[PDB]
Design an enzyme around this catalytic site. Structure first.
Site, PDB file in Angstrom:
ATOM      1  N   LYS A  60      45.007  35.820  40.745  1.00  0.00           N
ATOM      2  CA  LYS A  60      46.453  35.935  40.509  1.00  0.00           C
ATOM      3  C   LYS A  60      47.139  36.965  41.403  1.00  0.00           C
ATOM      4  O   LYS A  60      48.348  36.904  41.626  1.00  0.00           O
ATOM      5  CB  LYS A  60      46.756  36.232  39.038  1.00  0.00           C
ATOM      6  N   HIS A 180      39.298  46.526  30.390  1.00  0.00           N
ATOM      7  CA  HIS A 180      40.078  46.827  31.583  1.00  0.00           C
ATOM      8  C   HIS A 180      40.599  48.256  31.512  1.00  0.00           C
ATOM      9  O   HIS A 180      41.178  48.667  30.508  1.00  0.00           O
ATOM     10  CB  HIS A 180      41.238  45.844  31.755  1.00  0.00           C
ATOM     11  N   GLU A 254      35.944  43.440  38.450  1.00  0.00           N
ATOM     12  CA  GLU A 254      36.916  42.418  38.829  1.00  0.00           C
ATOM     13  C   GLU A 254      38.136  42.964  39.570  1.00  0.00           C
ATOM     14  O   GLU A 254      39.251  42.912  39.052  1.00  0.00           O
ATOM     15  CB  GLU A 254      37.359  41.633  37.592  1.00  0.00           C
TER      16      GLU A 254
END
Lengths: 389, 94
Positions: A60, A180, A254
């Site tokens: 994204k 995250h 990530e």
């Protein structure tokens, strides 16, 4: 798909100025320039700092075919957030063992597709998604998504217990824990909390009888060296003792903004000007490559400073990009340079932006070239698409 | 706790209007089952978010649905009602 050569005598300044020169008479559209060499340099930086973690790039941030191609070429994994994304990645020729879906809210068609494509590793942050996971894909591999102490996302420890219990009942295999930690956060101790929560699962799932072999640490990286250096300065002493090499641990990351954010530069044109302090209108704005403003400094191309406001071509009240800036007197037809234009600036061409997308230009250095050539990457079959000169 | 949210369906495309202020807990599950129901019985081909412009949590909800997968839609679109005092995000299916 074309990247020009650069020697020590040449710089980004002259390719910018040349593209400016040729675009001035032609299309007059904006231009994007991306350094893949800095991506490779960041891969070497990653391997330098911590090599036992496999990065899975969040598409994204940038979904251009080129970046995805060179990242697949680097061996870097892929974090998915849409089915079209998974379609492009699978079409490229990527193995499903290095693919992960990340969207916080899954749909039935998306997970049916994920099941049909053979991807088993996926994350989850609630009981409903677990329910549909068990309902449609009985052989899915589940990563538990936990919250962080920094409007809301993640799962509480108690609800994590309930999640693993239900998952045990629903006969689905849990393999790891997901979270995250934002780039902006500098509060070190926070990470500990997160990791402690993972330890909780390491116990609870361990008590229920499931096999754990993977840890995802997120994608909160700015891109600079000292950031990742502090990251390792906090994570490395604690990680090697709780999951050492040979314990059957496969750590995953990530990165998204990390590889591309400061790697891209945008050249923009001026179309309007108004004197009230001044207000100036570009041919682009927030409705395109400037969504990142919702969550970085302009420089003048040509050779007395005034305060001014920036507006796009939509002319509407919402098209504010920068509240206040300092610039010399300018006229229509001038060029403006924007650094750090990699984070969420690439979107698909449609009626949303009048079928207008900036051109794709790529840059590469000789040093990075020999740096990829000695690594034995340039010789494999997966890159038959490359065209460099 | 029971939560009431205003949502309107028209032309096979669903529109969600969010009220001003913060969200109550368990809202994640709420928009989750909202999408589940958006797909199973009413079979939407597109989901949409609309909310008032002048608020201090504009960026918060924007980034929220941004992470949720929604994308920004410029006012003036044929499927978007002509109202310049509202911000719009969009998520499209296959």
């Amino acid at each position: 798909y074309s990247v020009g050569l650069l020697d020590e005598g040449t710089d980004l300044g002259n390719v910018i100025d040349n593209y400016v020169y040729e675009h001035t008479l032609t299309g007059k559209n904006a231009f994007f320039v991306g350094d893949l060499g800095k991506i490779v340099k960041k891969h070497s930086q990653w391997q330098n700092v911590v090599a036992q973690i496999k990065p899975f790039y969040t598409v994204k941030c940038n979904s251009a075919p080129a970046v995805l191609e060179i990242l697949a070429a680097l061996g870097t994994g892929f974090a998915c957030s849409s089915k079209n994304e998974m379609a492009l990645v699978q079409e490229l020729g990527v193995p499903p063992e290095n693919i992960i879906y990340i969207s916080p809210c899954k749909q039935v068609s998306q997970i049916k597709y994920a099941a049909k494509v053979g991807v088993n590793i996926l994350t989850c942050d609630n009981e409903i998604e677990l329910k549909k996971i068990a309902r449609n894909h009985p052989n899915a591999k589940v990563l538990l998504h936990i919250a962080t102490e920094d409007m809301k996302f993640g799962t509480t420890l108690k609800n994590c217990r309930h999640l693993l219990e239900c998952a045990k009942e629903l006969d689905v295999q849990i393999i790891g824990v997901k979270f995250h930690v934002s780039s902006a956060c500098k509060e070190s101790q926070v990470y500990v909390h997160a990791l402690s929560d993972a330890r909780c699962v390491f116990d609870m799932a361990g008590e229920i009888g499931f096999t754990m072999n993977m840890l995802d640490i997120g994608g909160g990286f700015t891109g600079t060296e000292f950031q990742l250096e502090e990251v390792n300065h906090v994570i490395s002493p604690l990680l090697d003792i709780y999951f050492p090499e040979g314990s059957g641990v496969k750590i995953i990351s990530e990165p998204g903004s990390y590889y591309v954010s400061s790697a891209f530069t945008l050249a923009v044109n001026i179309i309007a000007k108004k004197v009230v302090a001044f207000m100036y209108y570009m041919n682009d704005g927030v409705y395109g490559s400037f969504a990142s403003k919702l969550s970085t400094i302009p420089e003048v191309h040509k050779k007395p400073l005034f305060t001014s406001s920036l507006w796009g071509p939509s002319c509407d009240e919402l098209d504010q990009i920068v509240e206040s800036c300092l610039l010399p007197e300018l006229n229509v037809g001038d060029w403006l340079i924007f650094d750090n234009m990699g984070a969420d600036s690439f979107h698909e061409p449609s009626a949303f932006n009048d079928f207008q997308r900036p051109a794709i230009y790529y840059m590469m250095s000789f040093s990075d070239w020999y740096e990829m050539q000695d690594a034995g990457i340039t010789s494999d079959s997966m890159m038959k698409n490359f065209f460099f000169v | 706790k029971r939560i009431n949210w205003r949502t309107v369906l028209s032309g096979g495309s669903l529109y969600i209007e969010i009220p001003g202020g913060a969200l109550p807990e368990g809202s994640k599950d709420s928009f989750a089952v909202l999408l589940e129901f958006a797909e199973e019985q009413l079979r939407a081909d597109h989901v949409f978010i609309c909310f008032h412009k002048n608020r201090e949590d504009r960026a918060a909800l924007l980034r929220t649905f941004s992470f949720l997968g929604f994308e920004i839609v410029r006012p003036g679109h044929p499927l978007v009602p002509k109202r310049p005092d509202a911000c719009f995000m969009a998520y499209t299916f296959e």
